[PDB]
Write an enzyme that holds these catalytic residues in place. Structure first.
Site, mmCIF file in Angstrom:
data_model
loop_
_atom_site.group_PDB
_atom_site.id
_atom_site.type_symbol
_atom_site.label_atom_id
_atom_site.label_comp_id
_atom_site.label_asym_id
_atom_site.label_seq_id
_atom_site.Cartn_x
_atom_site.Cartn_y
_atom_site.Cartn_z
ATOM 1 N NE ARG A 1 -2.089 3.148 0.478
ATOM 2 C CZ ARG A 1 -2.846 4.247 0.402
ATOM 3 N NH1 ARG A 1 -3.622 4.598 1.425
ATOM 4 N NH2 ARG A 1 -2.815 4.999 -0.703
ATOM 5 C CG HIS B 1 -8.381 0.186 -4.230
ATOM 6 N ND1 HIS B 1 -7.846 -1.057 -3.957
ATOM 7 C CD2 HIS B 1 -9.006 0.585 -3.096
ATOM 8 C CE1 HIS B 1 -8.134 -1.391 -2.712
ATOM 9 N NE2 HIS B 1 -8.838 -0.413 -2.169
ATOM 10 C CD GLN C 1 -13.017 -2.554 -2.791
ATOM 11 O OE1 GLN C 1 -12.338 -2.382 -1.770
ATOM 12 N NE2 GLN C 1 -14.176 -3.228 -2.783
ATOM 13 C CG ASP D 1 -14.044 5.941 -2.818
ATOM 14 O OD1 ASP D 1 -14.276 5.493 -1.672
ATOM 15 O OD2 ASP D 1 -12.897 6.268 -3.188
ATOM 16 C CB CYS E 1 -14.453 0.763 -2.280
ATOM 17 S SG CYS E 1 -14.124 2.524 -2.089
ATOM 18 N NE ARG F 1 -10.090 -5.113 -0.798
ATOM 19 C CZ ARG F 1 -9.758 -4.023 -0.099
ATOM 20 N NH1 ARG F 1 -10.689 -3.171 0.318
ATOM 21 N NH2 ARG F 1 -8.479 -3.784 0.195
#
Lengths: 298, 295, 295
Positions: C101, C128, C131, C224, C252, C280
């Protein structure tokens, strides 16, 4: 009852030989030994975080069948809210070994005086004995031997690495030269003990300020970062020229992290003489071996 | 449908015996139960950090075959970035239990109002029920039957430990006495529930400022870290002399030696403090098993 | 040799199909596949903490038989102390993959360039992609085949979810629409690459400022977190009604209920938000497994 590993001379030569032999065995079959099967716990404690030390210990424990409990510097520091003795007594109920990164040796001693399980110095101000274990393994595999090699360390002679290489090296039977300027000499009592231990192994201890003379005919060249005020260290840089004065088969070690261009150049770090990456990998196998040996003795 | 553990009285006297009997079985055979084999996940979440809670929980989880995911207070506090409900519902998909160290009781209830897996108070501002389970376990291995013993607690009578020894003690049928200075008494509702529970078990609840009277004839002497009003409540050899001759000393830790307890008491033969820390593992292990098989 | 996953289009359409199909097999049988038995190690490293990412990844890794070494934002950031190339060479000696990350894409590219194990983008400034795999997985289990479906994203068109839904969405064969205001456009080159990938899969890309239109007839509505000119783009009961009758909503997390999405939409019958969060776990295992057998 109960063995610890707080400084390189805590092992005797034969015992250091055994541990290093077992490191060779474990590199080849990494999951062949399971003394922490259960899983049993091992404490892995950081007064100051070290990421490479966490990776190697935490996976190495898991691979012996155990479960490393890891605690950060983001927690209350160990001697602040209760004595280190109390912490040792309690931890001894939860885990089979205690691995600890910390500052003074007096804190390690405090913990080790009352623990009913092994205490391992992960890295301290004074010593880095787990690194030297991995250094020695890297030397054993690269050169086929240990006894009688000539090892030279360049830079700060007072740092943890310089002390450990002195103690761990002579234990292994290696002629250790520390090459350091002006007033960056080894702590005297460390130097005395390394000379004393050298009398049983056929080794010796040399301290000099002449980087050329220390490089000449050496088998292993070693350096560390200039503090883990830099004008006095530049003659001690590991570069092509200095390495050219060494034995033609000489190898280069660096415990990392490296600052390319200061204590070591890119030609030497990236060159055929550099064992730096195997050395890093070897933290994992050496510390594994250390633990097994310690556990079967405690 | 779903049992939780947020305070000592969520379990019933009968049920608390089951957890305790199971905890002794687990102390003897630490890897014999593997309900979390897979590994399945358990959440271990700290709003404020606790080292000893981390050790005991994380390990006990691994030895049940599962895997603990530990998050520190070095991450975004749980109710700030999204509702406690929302987080609860997500965690529910990843783990089979949620172990949370947090502050106010309402946060726990918020999480446990919607979780599809058991929620455990690791330690909070108002109760410490896992510590008392460990306390009761070690009392039981030293003196046998729990029903009827006299337990006195000394020090800050308003903290999580007193609430829990009150709640846990009477549950197990022990006579609980909180010895506290004038401005430091238990939450009155916790106090009343403890009186309400004590009727079922033959227990009793006492609150006092009389250290000497509370220490007298006591079977178990307990204290926690605390301040001029607190000093007559110190666990010292002279206070211990007033107790029963067979008496034991517990302390949840850490100790501040020379304040609430003395070197001679905590290192003396009546001290059970080390067995007391150890049993955090066994008691919490047995708690997990008990809850998971009823959820 | 050595496959990395740093943006969604790192996988070709066929390669993507495989991962998703595997995700469904792993959901049905979580501990069936065991490529990291040993345990072998995987690095899970956060320049910026992310609790939900930690959970899914760490347990994912445990259930393939491996051990996740997790390093927090609470240690020195990964490039400040040794070069990334050196870090990569060292980690390649301890672990069998690196989950990371971080911020700029050039940081992932640097590590990926010299590591001898798969590098995975867990979350970054630009993308991302993990996701979206979870998104795609959740859309698939709801509606069957992915080809030809219409999906619309609402809010900031320049963020990581926006990029990834374009690239990941068109890779699956999906008609992707970003509904974004003013000067919150997708990155031009990410939009370009989405348009090329869409000509390949025979899908398309639309970017508009008319929420009403983007909502119209859509199969999937997504959003989001966000603050003023986003308010006409909210996922409300109204905007949902303008879509297809059998539509689904994704988000998400975490959701700021009242802002980008309302209570009645999110707790409604079109909401797949919790399946999306569960998946996930399953989609990242599938990726791990897939990448590992090709490296």
């Amino acid at each position: 009852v109960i063995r610890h590993f707080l400084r390189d001379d805590d092992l005797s030569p034969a015992e250091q030989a055994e541990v290093l032999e077992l490191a060779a065995e474990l590199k080849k079959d990494p999951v062949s030994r399971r003394p922490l099967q259960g899983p049993r716990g091992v404490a892995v404690i950081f007064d100051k975080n070290s990421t490479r030390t966490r990776f190697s210990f935490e996976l190495g424990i898991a691979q012996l069948g155990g479960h490393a409990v890891v605690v950060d510097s983001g927690s209350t520091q160990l001697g602040r809210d209760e004595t280190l003795q109390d912490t040792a007594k309690v931890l001894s109920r939860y885990v089979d070994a205690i691995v600890w990164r910390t500052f003074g040796q007096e804190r390690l001693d405090a913990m080790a005086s009352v623990a009913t399980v092994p205490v391992i110095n992960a890295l301290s101000d004074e010593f880095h004995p787990c690194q030297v274990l991995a250094d020695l393994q890297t030397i054993a595999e690269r050169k086929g031997a240990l006894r009688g090699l000539r090892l030279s360390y360049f830079g700060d002679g007072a740092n943890n690495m310089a002390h450990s290489l002195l103690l761990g090296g002579v234990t292994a039977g290696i002629h250790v030269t520390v090459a350091a300027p002006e007033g960056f000499l080894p702590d005297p009592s460390v130097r005395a003990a390394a000379e004393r231990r050298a009398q049983d192994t056929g080794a010796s201890v040399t301290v000099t300020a002449d980087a050329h003379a220390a490089a000449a005919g050496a088998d292993v060249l070693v350096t560390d970062t200039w503090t883990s005020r830099v004008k006095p260290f530049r003659p001690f840089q590991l570069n092509s020229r200095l390495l050219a004065l060494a034995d033609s088969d000489a190898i280069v070690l660096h415990c990392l992290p490296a600052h390319r261009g200061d204590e070591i150049t890119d030609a030497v770090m990236d060159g055929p003489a550099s064992a730096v990456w195997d050395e890093a990998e070897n933290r994992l196998h050496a510390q594994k071996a250390l633990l097994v040996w310690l556990l079967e003795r405690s």
